[PDB]
Swiss-Prot record, chain B:
Its main location: nucleus. Expressed in liver, lung, spleen and kidney. Weakly expressed in thymus, testis and ovary. Weakly or not expressed in heart, brain, skeletal muscle, placenta, pancreas, prostate, small intestine, colon and peripheral blood leukocytes. This is RNA-binding protein PNO1. The chain holds residues 73 to 250 of 252 of the full protein. The lineage of its organism: Eukaryota, Metazoa, Chordata, Craniata, Vertebrata. GO terms for cellular component: cytosol; nucleolus; nucleoplasm; nucleus; small-subunit processome. One of its GO terms (biological process) is ribosomal small subunit biogenesis. Keywords: Acetylation, Nucleus, RNA-binding. Belongs to the PNO1 family. GO terms for molecular function: RNA binding. It is found in: Nucleus, Nucleolus. Part of the small subunit (SSU) processome, composed of more than 70 proteins and the RNA chaperone small nucleolar RNA (snoRNA) U3.
UniProtKB/Swiss-Prot annotation, chain C:
PROSITE patterns: RIBOSOMAL_S28E. Transmembrane segments: none annotated. It is found in: Cytoplasm, Cytosol; Cytoplasm; Rough endoplasmic reticulum; Nucleus, Nucleolus. One of its GO terms (cellular component) is cytosol. Belongs to the eukaryotic ribosomal protein eS28 family. One of its GO terms (molecular function) is RNA binding. Pfam families: Ribosomal_S28e. The modification Phosphoserine is found at S34. It comes from Homo sapiens (Human). The keyword Ribonucleoprotein applies. This is Small ribosomal subunit protein eS28. The keyword Phosphoprotein applies.
Curated annotation (Swiss-Prot), chain D:
There is a cross-link at K32 (Glycyl lysine isopeptide (Lys-Gly) (interchain with G-Cter in SUMO2)). The keyword Transport does not apply. The keyword Cytoplasm applies. The lineage of its organism: Eukaryota, Metazoa, Chordata, Craniata, Vertebrata. GO terms for biological process: cytoplasmic translation; regulation of translational fidelity; ribosomal small subunit assembly; ribosomal small subunit biogenesis; translation; translational initiation. One of its GO terms (cellular component) is nucleoplasm. This is Small ribosomal subunit protein uS7. SUPFAM superfamilies: Ribosomal protein S7. Component of the small ribosomal subunit. The ribosome is a large ribonucleoprotein complex responsible for the synthesis of proteins in the cell. Part of the small subunit (SSU) processome, first precursor of the small eukaryotic ribosomal subunit. During the assembly of the SSU processome in the nucleolus, many ribosome biogenesis factors, an RNA chaperone and ribosomal proteins associate with the nascent pre-rRNA and work in concert to generate RNA folding, modifications, rearrangements and cleavage as well as targeted degradation of pre-ribosomal RNA by the RNA exosome. Keywords: Acetylation, Cytoplasm, Isopeptide bond, Nucleus, Phosphoprotein, Ribonucleoprotein, Ribosomal protein, Ubl conjugation. Its main location: cytoplasm. It comes from Homo sapiens (Human). It is found in: Cytoplasm; Nucleus, Nucleolus. The gene is RPS5. The modification Phosphoserine is found at S127. It holds the Pfam family Ribosomal_S7.
Swiss-Prot record, chain E:
Keywords: Endonuclease, Hydrolase, Metal-binding, Nuclease, Nucleus, Phosphoprotein, Zinc, Zinc-finger. It is an enzyme of class 3 (hydrolase). Pfam families: PIN_6, WRNPLPNID, Zn_ribbon_NOB1. This is RNA-binding protein NOB1. A zinc finger (NOB1) spans 173-245. PANTHER family: RNA-BINDING PROTEIN NOB1.
Length: 135, 178, 61, 189, 325
């Protein structure tokens, strides 16, 4: 079940790895991105809200997605990394790095590593006050 | 054979040139990856050849060279070569508190302290490496250690004096089964 | 399952009261798998251990 | 040929576990006529591994305070216990002693890590020298509480403890204590 | 086939290619690296020690003063050069060799002296460092007697004479391109790339100039016709009054002025090595910093540290809230 491709050529999907500051999403989609293939959160692998954004949950998520994509015939993935963006922080967290490495171990050819974080041109006001944020 | 390209700024060209042997030797010796530096595109290129021992070594080398470009020492990113459970988390200094001008500079000062001492103290307690780019903070360490270091740094850049931060991080490091 | 062991290098004295010895372990199963383990009592270069279970790794990092 | 107490052979003794083989010192050059030697054996670290194991059993038999200096009594009790072992089992009593030491010593033990107040223990491995030492100590202690207030002579009780530990049955004090220690260590990890 | 200190320092297993293996005692006794001294106690002993009579040493000295490399070489370098000269005279005919070397010709270009050409990893527009090129990237690679020398100045004077030289590779070298430092006040050239004050006039004025030496005996020098090199922009600025004591750091105006001793502690100057077999036993991934010593409070730094700060011109604008040590 999958594309009818010779062994020389690879099937490309686009893996959106979005690491929010509470968990991590692994969302493999079409090259267009409209039709999806797989997605497992940090929360569907570990049964605790404390360890939701942990690299353990992210790497288990990446192995689950890699196995599912081997089942459906996709052999290679382009990578579109993401942080929360906008007013929030712009750098993808350690969970995104952990998911990327874990899907790199799991037999996947890697295509283009590209960061799409929604950087504002000129943002609205920060969620925190004037006093500060994050302890 | 796949490749990864990472950029280098103008202020990291000379550290790249001086430390070049110490960068390319560990990548090609035991990881078995081709490496070059394109002067036209200003990119470090890392490639997989037939001599590559295992998969995902190129990701390890990419994290190593990226950490060196962000401002870390060559041995502190050779730690990323050897160890598996190490990450590179970074944030802007205005991400937690909107600081304008001179206030912002003072915040930078109380990440460093006098002689850098405060920064080194955190590096002694959290077992991390912190790099202060001009308005950026980069932490290299384990995930829990990154959390402790970012808690200390965020406490410093919203107003807390260094002694309170030292006491808090020493209590947390005592509680963290270190 | 029980597997016998080898001593490659004595590493140090750790523990609360300095009672445990951190030591490198080679295997008698003709493998080069060296694991760091904590032992209780006096050990020297030339000892043979008896690991009740070998999947455990000591306090590394 | 050198025979312990003039009658007991030492070449028939075989070591089952090779980790304790280099420390149970009984086989060829370490066989003596009598358990009594009075040599300087605690002068330097690991020198007591070179000691004949019958001398170790004798030296751990004088432990309690009222017998704390009498060694000729301990060696004659060792001789009598070897007689009891030989008439009960029929084997070489040195082999029974070695099997008891092998089956008595715990392989892993709990220990305290952290600071004063840390009430959780980590399971660690046990050194072979410490394993032999604690096996001898537990066998002698089993001989002690096996013969406090009863008609049975302590030579008979020492022989019974040695035979029960060599057989591995759940009757020896040393076997029960080893099982308890290993279960506690497996529960802690 | 004479061996310099660079052969044993770079671990040249080249005893098989040669048969006249001759070394001085001072080239083998001055080595401080423990690994190669251990190697010398293991290596097969076909080398034999030989001392030159000093007429060859005299002649090597008077053309060392003529080739412009006499301040660059040391005494043991002169001894090794006299050794290979006297064996070439003893075994081979002496008439093959020309004395009083030729005149250098000038050919300048617009390239900066800091252009990173002939660096193995760097590539302009393919140049790759591969696992199959590590043993071969040493230098520009190209019968009975030879040398095992890596220092450039000896090679420069030696090919000015005309003896064939070899390296830890097999085949001999015909062309040698490298860099020298030239004073633009007194026009005296030095082959020592480490030094920053010239030996003749003592000013901090040495600048990089590239040189190429042929096997025939022709030296030629490439200068840079770039005005950025000879620009007096950040050279004049106000200096503070000279200060003494245990903590003064003077602006380093001469090569031999007496600085106070301000050394880093041993805990401060340990860098972590990660490939040690006992590294994983450590409680931390990195070496603990020094925050307790007196050298930490005095903000003592390593000599190699902060090089780009010194390269900025002092008559410029730093950031408002920073202090430059
Ligand atoms: Zn000059």
């Amino acid at each position: 079940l999958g594309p009818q491709v010779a062994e020389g050529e690879n099937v490309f999907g686009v893996c959106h790895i979005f690491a929010s500051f509470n968990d991590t999403f692994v969302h493999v989609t079409d090259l267009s991105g409209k039709e999806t293939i797989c997605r497992v959160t940090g929360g569907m692998k570990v049964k605790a809200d404390r360890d939701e954004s942990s690299p353990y949950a992210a790497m288990l998520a990446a192995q689950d997605v890699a196995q599912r994509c081997k089942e459906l015939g996709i052999t290679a993935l382009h990578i579109k990394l993401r942080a929360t963006g906008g007013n929030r922080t712009k750098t993808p967290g350690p969970g995104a790095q952990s998911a990327l490495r874990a899907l790199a171990r799991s037999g996947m050819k890697i295509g283009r590593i590209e960061d799409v974080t929604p950087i504002p041109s000129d943002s609205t006001r920060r969620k925190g006050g004037r006093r500060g944020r994050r302890l | 054979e796949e490749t990864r390209k990472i950029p280098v700024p103008a202020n990291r060209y000379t550290p790249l040139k001086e430390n070049w042997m110490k960068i390319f030797t560990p990548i090609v010796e035991h990881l078995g990856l081709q490496i070059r530096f394109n002067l036209k595109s200003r990119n470090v290129e890392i490639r997989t050849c037939k001599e590559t021992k295992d998969v995902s070594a190129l990701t390890k080398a990419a994290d190593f060279v990226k950490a060196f470009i962000l401002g870390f020492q060559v041995e502190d990113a050779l730690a990323l070569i050897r160890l598996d459970d190490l990450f590179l988390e970074s944030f802007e200094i205005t991400d937690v508190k909107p600081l304008k001008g001179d206030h912002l500079s003072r915040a930078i000062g109380r990440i460093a302290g006098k002689g850098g001492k405060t920064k080194f103290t955190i590096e002694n307690v959290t077992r991390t490496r912190i790099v202060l780019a001009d308005v950026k903070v980069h932490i290299l360490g384990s995930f829990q250690n990154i959390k402790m270091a970012r808690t200390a740094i965020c406490n410093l850049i919203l107003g807390n004096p260094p002694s309170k931060v030292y006491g808090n991080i020493r209590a947390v490091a005592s509680r963290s089964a270190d | 399952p029980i597997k016998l062991a080898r001593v490659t290098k004595v590493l140090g004295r750790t523990g609360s009261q300095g009672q445990c010895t951190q030591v490198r372990v080679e295997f008698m199963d003709d493998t080069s798998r060296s694991i760091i383990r904590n032992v209780k009592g006096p050990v020297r270069e030339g000892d043979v251990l008896t690991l009740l279970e070998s999947e455990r790794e000591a306090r590394r990092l | 040929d050198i025979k312990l107490f003039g009658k007991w052979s030492t070449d028939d003794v075989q070591i089952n576990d090779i980790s304790l083989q280099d420390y149970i010192a009984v086989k060829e050059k370490y066989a003596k006529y009598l358990p009594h030697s009075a040599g300087r054996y605690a002068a330097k670290r690991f020198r007591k591994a070179q000691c004949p194991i019958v001398e170790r059993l004798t030296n751990s038999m004088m432990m309690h305070g009222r017998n704390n200096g009498k060694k000729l009594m301990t060696v004659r009790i060792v001789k009598h216990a070897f007689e009891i072992i030989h008439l009960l089992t029929g084997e070489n009593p040195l082999q029974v002693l070695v099997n008891a030491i092998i089956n008595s010593g715990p392989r892993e033990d709990s220990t305290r890590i952290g600071r004063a107040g840390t009430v959780r223990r980590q399971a660690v491995d046990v050194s072979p020298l410490r394993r032999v030492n604690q096996a001898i100590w537990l066998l002698c202690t089993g001989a002690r509480e096996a013969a406090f207030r009863n008609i049975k002579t302590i030579a008979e009780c020492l022989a019974d403890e040695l035979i029960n530990a060599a057989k591995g049955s759940s009757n020896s004090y040393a076997i029960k204590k080893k099982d308890e220690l290993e279960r506690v260590a497996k529960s802690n990890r | 086939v004479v061996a310099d200190a660079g052969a044993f320092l770079r671990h040249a297993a080249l005893q098989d290619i040669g048969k006249n293996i001759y070394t001085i005692r001072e080239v083998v006794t001055e080595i401080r690296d423990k690994a190669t001294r251990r190697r010398l106690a293991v290596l097969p002993y076909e080398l034999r020690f030989k001392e030159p009579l000093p007429e060859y040493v005299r002649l090597v000295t008077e053309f060392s003063k003529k080739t412009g490399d006499y301040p660059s070489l040391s005494a043991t370098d002169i001894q090794v050069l006299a050794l290979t000269y006297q064996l070439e005279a003893e075994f081979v005919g002496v008439s093959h060799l020309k004395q009083e070397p030729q005149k250098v010709k000038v050919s300048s270009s617009i390239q900066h002296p800091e252009t990173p050409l002939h660096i193995s990893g760097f590539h302009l527009p393919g140049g790759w460092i591969t696992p199959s090129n590590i043993k071969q990237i040493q230098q520009e690679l190209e019968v009975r007697v030879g040398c095992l020398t890596t220092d450039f100045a000896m090679q420069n004077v030696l090919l000015q004479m005309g003896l064939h030289v070899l390296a830890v590779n097999g085949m001999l070298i015909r062309e040698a391109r490298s860099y020298i430092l030239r004073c633009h006040g007194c026009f005296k050239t030095t082959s020592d790339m480490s030094r920053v004050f010239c030996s003749h006039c003592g000013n901090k004025t040495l600048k990089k100039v590239s040189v190429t030496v042929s096997d025939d005996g022709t030296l030629h020098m490439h200068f840079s016709r770039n005005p950025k090199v000879l620009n007096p922009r950040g050279l004049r600025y106000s200096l503070p009054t000279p200060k003494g004591g245990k903590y003064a750091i003077n602006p380093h105006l001469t090569e031999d002025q007496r600085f106070p001793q301000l050394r880093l502690s041993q805990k401060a100057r340990q860098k972590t090595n990660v490939f040690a077999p006992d590294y994983i036993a450590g409680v931390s991934p990195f070496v603990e910093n020094d925050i307790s010593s007196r050298s930490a409070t005095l903000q003592v730094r390593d000599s190699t540290l902060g090089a780009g700060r010194r390269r900025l011109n002092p008559n410029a604008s730093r950031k408002k809230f920073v202090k430059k040590r």
